[PDB]
Amino acid sequence: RECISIHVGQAGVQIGNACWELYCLEHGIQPDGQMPSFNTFFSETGAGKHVPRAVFVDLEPTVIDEVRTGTYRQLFHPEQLITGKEDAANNYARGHYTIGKEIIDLVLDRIRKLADQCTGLQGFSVFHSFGGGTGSGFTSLLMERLSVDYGKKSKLEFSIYPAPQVSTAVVEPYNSILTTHTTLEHSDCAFMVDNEAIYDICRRNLDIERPTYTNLNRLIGQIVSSITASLRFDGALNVDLTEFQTNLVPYPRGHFPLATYAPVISAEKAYHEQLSVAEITNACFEPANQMVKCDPRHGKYMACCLLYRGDVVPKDVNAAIATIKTKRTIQFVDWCPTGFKVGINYEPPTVVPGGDLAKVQRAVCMLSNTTAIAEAWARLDHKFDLMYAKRAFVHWYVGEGMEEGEFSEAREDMAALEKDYEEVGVDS
Amino acid sequence: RECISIHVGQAGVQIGNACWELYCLEHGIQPDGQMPSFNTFFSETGAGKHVPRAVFVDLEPTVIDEVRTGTYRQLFHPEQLITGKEDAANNYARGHYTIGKEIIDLVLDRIRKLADQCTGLQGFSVFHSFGGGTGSGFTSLLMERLSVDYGKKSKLEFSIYPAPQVSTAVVEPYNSILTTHTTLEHSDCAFMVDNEAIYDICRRNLDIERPTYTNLNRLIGQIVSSITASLRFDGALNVDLTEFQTNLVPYPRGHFPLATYAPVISAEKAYHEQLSVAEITNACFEPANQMVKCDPRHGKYMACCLLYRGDVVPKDVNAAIATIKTKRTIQFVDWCPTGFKVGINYEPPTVVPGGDLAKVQRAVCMLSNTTAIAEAWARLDHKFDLMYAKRAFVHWYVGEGMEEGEFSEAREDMAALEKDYEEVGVDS
Amino acid sequence: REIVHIQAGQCGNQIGAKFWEVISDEHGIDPTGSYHGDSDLQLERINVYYNEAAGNKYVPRAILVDLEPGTMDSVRSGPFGQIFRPDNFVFGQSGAGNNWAKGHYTEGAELVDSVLDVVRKESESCDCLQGFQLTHSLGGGTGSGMGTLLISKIREEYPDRIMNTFSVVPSPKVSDTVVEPYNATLSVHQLVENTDETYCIDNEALYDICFRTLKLTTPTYGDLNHLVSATMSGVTTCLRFPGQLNADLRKLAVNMVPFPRLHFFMPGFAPLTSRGSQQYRALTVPELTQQMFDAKNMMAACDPRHGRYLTVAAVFRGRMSMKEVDEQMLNVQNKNSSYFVEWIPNNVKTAVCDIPPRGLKMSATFIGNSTAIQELFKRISEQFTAMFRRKAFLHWYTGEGMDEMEFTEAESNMNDLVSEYQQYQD
Amino acid sequence: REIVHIQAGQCGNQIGAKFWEVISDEHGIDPTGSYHGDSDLQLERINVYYNEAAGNKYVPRAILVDLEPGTMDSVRSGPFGQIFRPDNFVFGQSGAGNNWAKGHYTEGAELVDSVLDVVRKESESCDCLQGFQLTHSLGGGTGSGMGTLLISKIREEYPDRIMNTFSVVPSPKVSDTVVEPYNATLSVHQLVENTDETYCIDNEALYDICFRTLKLTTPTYGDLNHLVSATMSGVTTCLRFPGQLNADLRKLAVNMVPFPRLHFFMPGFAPLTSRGSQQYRALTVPELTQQMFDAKNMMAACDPRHGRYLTVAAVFRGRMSMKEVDEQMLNVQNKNSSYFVEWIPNNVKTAVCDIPPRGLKMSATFIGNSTAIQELFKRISEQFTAMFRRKAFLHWYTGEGMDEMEFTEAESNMNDLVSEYQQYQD
């Protein structure tokens, strides 16, 4: 019943920092590993120290060093903290090939070591970003190997969705297009969120006009914990990760369920307001709490999964579902009946001490696969196209051995993906 | 039930220093011999002082003087400390013949004296190095006599394997080739380790980038103690030295089992990590802990012996074996079924105060005979050949009475040895 | 004379957690395993569900099956999880994930061999089995998937024993798995012809009852599964305890099945009303019959007056007159003659037990076989077709080797049950 | 009437350490040697295994043999090592090293003369020997090597006494010595025709039982050898103590051997389950028979239902009815008729003792002679051949003078036992 977390790149690792901090908060784990009390994620020592079963990869020492100098440096095993010396430079060509390919063997052997520590490997999940060099480059490299060795294990990916308006990486389209090509075909499911959309959540629901990544990742951590800690904890409907895959992936392509999370409420907003299960789920179908800037009303739904924490009575859930099925404007694709996965954990929602979110007594996470995602690809299509037509920055990949045909090909694979969304949109 | 240790050359003696220090650590033996408490190795006096049954030979006063001025100078009997005045000069021709042959008679008589002190001589083992003058020269001289007098006793040799990359002895190939010729035929089993490989162990498992020989020999001492102290101590499966020979030597040639040792872990690496018997043995089949730079995956296995310390339950061992037999890529030679010797001592693993290795609760030593050893010989073949073709340094042997034909012959004997490995590799 | 029960799937395991609790209540058996009752009858027929182990320990004759230790553990952690022996916990490791193919066709299939071995061990422990009962969900992976596989093998080993099962039927509003109708379709395909009878439980209907008549605003599944266990326990106790009528499960099966393929049941239960009204209720046979006939007191989301009634069983617990029961059942038949099928004269049959359920003076269990049942099949079949055309999640299933033509036949078979209900609906 | 036991090899010495412990438990004999029991029977038949020395000291009639003082010392150091007299410790100095040639053929051979002399001294100390028993490993140097040599000489001196031995059979997964099959092959070659019967113990199977039914996660060899001693002690106590059936070892041997060469046994034991379930177990004869028949409760890594059963012995300890035992054995014969050999009518034989093992109400020992045994021989023979062709470690053996043609004949002889099992497998 075990799983592995993999943190690649800054985004992967810094999100991971929040994630493991939250898992410590879930059980009262001390920075040194001492836990007085979740062995699905952790491995126990004779001292009662538990080791989070995870791998941290950075090709630049700095971020891992940040871990190594922080409080959780005692928690993590030195072998889990893997670092190279040089970067990918925002570039798949080095991340996947030239540079990252050198260290990956080590990385894999640490993974395999942990796989041998697992007794019942259920699977794993990889945290990264769609635009970066290691964030997406190295990441797909890893998938290429992990899908061989662990072909039957859960291969869930979580990635930051490139913001349409702000991006620090000029060749991000190129990176992301190459990842599509290689991740679609290897991964089982990839989830993503938009930091821009999140900013809007922070300013509207948390009332914060100063979000940093350390805020943004707390919110992400919430979502992740709902599906990682609480799915291993007790509930009414205990849903596994393999079950998630088995209930969220409808086609052999990928699919890309997007996250939505409600409650996201400031402490003051929690006052004077009573949420019910149904009210929280109402919020879950509002564009306003959509974690990716993509309009839910534009597309049609294919999948939807609702996962519940704390004070949730199935009775209320059932009523809530009835209304979301019938009251809303949620259009859905023919193919699908509304079999929405309901996970119901008794495990209460948790809050980070010193965080922004209010203590809540119940909480709902929503995953959804909508046809509007093709528009996200359309965004990438043109951004890629523009650059590629001019061949701007192309020498930074070509010099590492990339082929122009390959890039065209990858775009075409994306186009095919868009076409399949088109297909799904056609009802039948 | 007694045995004799023989330390020839610096390498032999300095390793011995670590070895006898460890035996003192095993029982609380004071530098003066006072032991408050292993008489298989030691001889008791009426004062309760025990004398380690061993002979120290150096043809240069200095190293023995180092012993004579250290703390263990009180431990060793002055007659055990044998020294000449001049060296072999890295040269078999003087070590075996011209110089060492003069003192050897004394040496033998001290050995014989100890043999007479033994009541039930089980056998002995010789510590040396394959490249040096006394380390290999004198050593084989000794074997020539010991195999006559003690023909039925254990003749185990331990030698440093010449590092392929660093060697301080330009005629080491020549020395080692001559030893092959004379040791193969006289000895029963010779074990060896590579200081370069060890450095890699020190830097990767102990995390030490500054190993000296005094570190390197502690690690060697660990391995040796597992097979020397703990084989005389109590266990489930008490394995003797003669049993070792009877379980490790498959052919009348020699054979050369190589050492592998796992756990080799720094204190910090021990934290946050729980080793089981099975996990330790997993490490034992990893190239990474191979004490000789020779790839385990290259060759095929012929013999394998696993010796256990501390908290080992046969139950777990059995399971571990099942997986190494079936899970691994360990190819093995037809001839052999997988009868791997399992020695199981209750005697816990010991650690040198102020050492690098972490306190462990259980430990496993592995001996193995792989066909990849022929590549080691191939290395020597060409190194020898190059020198010999040019006849570089040849006058340093010829002037002592060596014959060129002899050198050719010795190479040919090595070639024959390689051919026999070839033979074994052919499965049948 | 004895029964073996097997629970599977998270649903089945949690239902059974309440079922066994009740059975031990009925007999005064402590959560730790020993008997501390106080009635002769409590031990007298205990054999049907318990083995008395040395020390006056009673072992529930049941196997708990799952593919995740954690659910099993949670069951074990409560009272009455201690009464089960470790040997009755048969489970694997890695879920099923609510996947029929995994459950039945592939992975769960692997576990079934160990389950069956224990089943065999228990079949030997019994003197004479009457039958077997299984608890599960129709749209679940282990509930239906693995469970079905097991059933086909048990039936094979014991053709002469009763094979029935109670199962949670996907409610119109709350499906959890997107392919829940697919799993259900496949289970019909397998179960119907590999079972003697199956009961149809709808959670939605149950949630309506709990608020509708019981006026409760906090139930959980444990409270609703209490109601489920009331019907299950109602059936077997009579068989166990002294009564007036004819107290044999097989005879019940005989009286309720007019046709080899149409054996689906609608359970209902009386009395079943809130405490407020309990001060305003009268306890008579007509009172129970009013609650029994009323469709709102059915646990299945069907409407018996929409369809036609083929068979009705009225089981009574406690002291009642024979006359009164006879007359009221007749009256029911008379007044609701428009719903009954004309081919079966006196289509309402009774069974009477003289032991009341603990705490009540009287009670009654409604078991019906109407044509209305077909409506559930119709809903599923339709939903199925849509999914079938799109292959939603079928890559998971076809990835594990499930072939679409097998599914095609499953669809037909669903439609066949509907057509046969139409054939006898007339 | 008396028995002499000889232990050899590290295995044999450690097994015997538990065996004798148990025997003294059975009779209330203290670790220091005196009798402090409390039952008449405890002293009454003590003669079979003990000599009473002056002072009411009991000397176990056994010889401890090894070629390393340290193992002997460790035995001596514990409780019950003090009950053995110094004269029963016969050992040399320098191992054997798990080398048959050393053990049997050369060096160990030297010690055997001193061992035998002590044997003779004890044979005189007995009034009338029933037989001898030896404990050892089949793949070990002194266990099998030297032990075999001894057996051939004892048999020579006493053709009319029972010669049996229990031996650890190389488990498929855990061999220690690379030539363990070689040593075993040689021991078959020597032992089979120089023994009346031999028992086949597989440590792997034992480790499965200890976790499988006993649910234990810490055993050592002492815990597994406890199980071994349970079967050994089970056999001889009946012979010692009052019962109902026929309590003679020779008669057991007669009933279990249909053919001069096929005398290999599969021991099993009941009851043998974890404490948790002990609260859910019932103690009946069928209960014991269920545990006895079940292959998983066998201590040999064989599968009796794969082969055919030639003979079965069921030994019972404690008060049981004759009827029940007879009927259940019959039932076994009936239901498992497909495994029994048709040539032997009523192939299941019984023996009944009225004394239960200390702490239990009842117990049973399963002894079988199936054809399935041949599978172990096949595994060894095959492994042997491969090694034979390569001469792995045979320089050690040929260095001590063991000739390859002797080994060749040994190989044949293994194959002969297999062919004879086939000859009666039919």
Ligand SMILES: Nc1nc2c(ncn2[C@@H]2O[C@H](COP(=O)(O)OP(=O)(O)OP(=O)(O)O)[C@@H](O)[C@H]2O)c(=O)[nH]1
């Ligand atoms: N949510 C979130 N997004 C982040 C975080 N750090 C970076 N990102 C986003 O991820 C992308 C940045 O990737 P980089 O940091 O440039 O690169 P990398 O993927 O770590 O790998 P390299 O390019 O080789 O350094 C941008 O789109 C950022 O907006 C973080 O902590 N949280």
Ligand SMILES: Nc1nc2c(ncn2[C@@H]2O[C@H](COP(=O)(O)OP(=O)(O)OP(=O)(O)O)[C@@H](O)[C@H]2O)c(=O)[nH]1
């Ligand atoms: N592990 C280990 N290797 C050593 C040690 N000392 C020397 N060596 C190695 O053994 C070889 C050196 O042999 P030398 O010290 O030159 O010579 P010797 O064998 O003592 O004899 P002479 O040549 O006559 O002085 C080199 O390959 C060294 O790397 C030591 O303390 N530990």
Ligand SMILES: Nc1nc2c(ncn2[C@@H]2O[C@H](COP(=O)(O)OP(=O)(O)O)[C@@H](O)[C@H]2O)c(=O)[nH]1
């Ligand atoms: N009455 C009832 N239904 C349940 C319970 N648990 C899950 N269910 C129903 O079972 C269906 C889900 O299947 P599930 O039991 O999770 O399948 P499995 O666990 O993979 O075999 C849904 O329709 C739920 O309403 C329960 O404890 N009681």
Ligand SMILES: Nc1nc2c(ncn2[C@@H]2O[C@H](COP(=O)(O)OP(=O)(O)O)[C@@H](O)[C@H]2O)c(=O)[nH]1
């Ligand atoms: N059951 C059991 N097997 C043992 C014990 N000791 C060694 N063995 C088995 O005996 C074989 C090894 O032979 P060994 O007894 O060392 O030979 P010897 O000591 O040279 O005669 C292996 O198959 C072990 O599993 C023990 O105490 N109990």
Ligand SMILES: [Mg+2]
């Ligand atoms: Mg970076």
Ligand SMILES: [Mg+2]
């Ligand atoms: Mg020197």
